[PDB]
Amino acid sequence: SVKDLANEASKYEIILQKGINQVGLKQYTQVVHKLDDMLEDIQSGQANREENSEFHGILTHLEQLIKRSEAQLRVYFISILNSIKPFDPQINITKKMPFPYYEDQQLGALSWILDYFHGNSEGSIIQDILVGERSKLILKCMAFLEPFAKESSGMNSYTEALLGFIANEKSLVDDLYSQYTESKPHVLSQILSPLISAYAKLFGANLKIVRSNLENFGFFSFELVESINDVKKSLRGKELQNYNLLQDCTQEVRQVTQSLFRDAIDRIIKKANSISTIPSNNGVTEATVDTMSRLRKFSEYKNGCLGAMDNITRENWLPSNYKEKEYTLQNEALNWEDHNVLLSCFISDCIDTLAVNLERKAQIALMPNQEPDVANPNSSKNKHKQRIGFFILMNLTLVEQIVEKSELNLMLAGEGHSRLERLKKRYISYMVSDWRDLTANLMEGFEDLVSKTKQYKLSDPSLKVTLKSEIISLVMPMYERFYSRYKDSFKNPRKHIKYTPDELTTVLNQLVR
Numbered sequence: 001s002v003k004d005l006a007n008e009a010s011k012y013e014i015i016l017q018k019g020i021n022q023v024g025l026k027q028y029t030q031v032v033h034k035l036d037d038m039l040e041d042i043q044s045g046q047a048n049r050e051e052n053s054e055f056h057g058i059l060t061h062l063e064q065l066i067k068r069s070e071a072q073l074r075v076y077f078i079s080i081l082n083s084i085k086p087f088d089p090q091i092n093i094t095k096k097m098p099f100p101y102y103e104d105q106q107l108g109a110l111s112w113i114l115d116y117f118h119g120n121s122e123g124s125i126i127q128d129i130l131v132g133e134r135s136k137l138i139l140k141c142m143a144f145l146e147p148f149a150k151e152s153s154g155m156n157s158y159t160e161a162l163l164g165f166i167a168n169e170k171s172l173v174d175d176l177y178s179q180y181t182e183s184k185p186h187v188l189s190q191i192l193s194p195l196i197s198a199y200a201k202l203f204g205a206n207l208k209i210v211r212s213n214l215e216n217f218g219f220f221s222f223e224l225v226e227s228i229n230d231v232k233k234s235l236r237g238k239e240l241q242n243y244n245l246l247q248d249c250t251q252e253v254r255q256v257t258q259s260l261f262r263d264a265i266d267r268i269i270k271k272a273n274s275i276s277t278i279p280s281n282n283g284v285t286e287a288t289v290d291t292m293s294r295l296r297k298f299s300e301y302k303n304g305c306l307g308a309m310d311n312i313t314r315e316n317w318l319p320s321n322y323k324e325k326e327y328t329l330q331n332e333a334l335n336w337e338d339h340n341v342l343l344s345c346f347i348s349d350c351i352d353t354l355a356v357n358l359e360r361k362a363q364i365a366l367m368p369n370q371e372p373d374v375a376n377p378n379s380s381k382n383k384h385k386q387r388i389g390f391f392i393l394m395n396l397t398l399v400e401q402i403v404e405k406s407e408l409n410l411m412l413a414g415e416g417h418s419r420l421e422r423l424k425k426r427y428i429s430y431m432v433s434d435w436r437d438l439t440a441n442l443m444e445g446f447e448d449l450v451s452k453t454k455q456y457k458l459s460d461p462s463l464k465v466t467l468k469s470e471i472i473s474l475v476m477p478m479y480e481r482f483y484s485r486y487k488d489s490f491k492n493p494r495k496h497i498k499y500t501p502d503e504l505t506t507v508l509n510q511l512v513r
Contacts, residue, residue, distance in 0.1 A: 029112065077110065139195065207256060287354065292399060366388070457513055
């Protein structure tokens with residue numbers, strides 16, 4: 001029945017010949033079947049006949065018509081995957097909108113065509129395609145955010161997008177394989193795989209830029225982390241032929257984040273000594289302004305300063321050789337295991353550092369060839385305490401300011417504030433030095449310290465009051481004694497004693513300037 005089969009075949013060819021789009025996919029499929037059938041319906045019941053197997057002419061025409069048709073299926077398939085041309089996601093991020101997704105009917109088809117091939121033991125190809133296209137697309141979509149991802153943070157949107165994408169990708173793999181819950185992982189692996197590799201490059205690229213200039217991009221590392229974690233929190237569970245690139249990155253980032261503290265404590269020293277002359281006004285050094293501008297920068301990333309506060313003793317951020325005296329830590333009754341206490345300590349150390357170092361440079365300048373006797377209100381060598389005191393206080397009042405105005409306040413809270421306080425007291429204990437002399441000395445000089453003290457006005461009420469009394473509650477008690485005691489040894493009073501304990505008390509009260 002040679003001419004029989006051939007005559008029927010054409011009917012089909014005249015069908016396939018029409019566009020797949022013009023023959024409800026399902027039908028097109030069926031026909032190709034009935035054909036791959038006739039192909040076999042002639043290679044079985046005629047292979048047995050040695051005196052009959054010669055329908056070679058028409059047979060070949062089938063093998064041909066088939067291959068071609070199947071190929072149009074691969075094509076239709078790819079056409080579908082692309083019915084959602086790549087787009088700029090920058091908008092789906094800002095106005096937090098969902099990404100376009102394949103319509104229902106489309107999935108059906110894809111699934112079908114997937115079935116068509118997987119059901120012919122040659123779907124290992126339709127697989128390669130499915131994966132190829134998707135990733136090529138997502139990749140291109142990402143291409144829009146990339147340029148911005150290099151330095152608001154462009155790294156953020158770049159991630160937000162990836163996460164989003166990783167999501168839609170899971171869905172899609174499942175919505176497509178509701179029949180083959182056997183290779184869902186391997187498939188989604190190949191799709192996400194490159195997406196990540198891209199993330200990784202871009203990611204590593206940023207760190208490279210951050211490791212470079214820590215002075216300004218330093219804090220970005222905290223963001224780099226939030227980013228890499230979120231990406232890792234999204235992948236959790238699914239397999240990834242390429243995961244090590246993330247475990248690597250976190251290693252790189254994390255390894256830059258604590259580097260920030262030993263570093264932070266350094267800028268402060270390398271910036272306090274930066275200049276060796278006491279400003280004309282005894283005022284706020286650019287250093288003081290820098291360290292705060294920087295500390296504050298820290299506070300803005302609380303959650304991140306803790307995440308990378310573990311496995312780090314505070315030795316990890318102090319000079320290799322540091323004097324315990326130069327700090328305000330004492331009441332070691334803190335649960336050093338708890339990060340918060342650490343973080344607070346850190347901050348308090350920076351402040352302490354800044355304060356001490358200014359005092360270093362301060363003493364050096366005013367009187368060199370004399371080994372700087374820092375942080376010691378009773379220095380016998382130091383003779384410019386008062387000024388130095390005023391000087392350091394003047395910056396602290398600024399330090400205090402930036403603190404109260406920010407997170408740094410909540411971070412120090414309590415212990416921090418207690419140290420800060422203890423610190424202020426150190427330098428006020430300073431300005432009062434000159435008076436302890438005058439007093440104990442005798443047991444003119446008075447007018448002297450009065451004049452001198454009138455030269456320093458403080459931008460803070462507390463200090464003024466504190467200093468007023470501090471002086472009073474030291475000179476007076478003492479003077480009254482000596483006064484009234486060795487007072488009457490002669491006769492005429494106001495003809496020798498130009499000053500009366502009562503008078504002095506008033507004079508001292510005029511020191512509100």
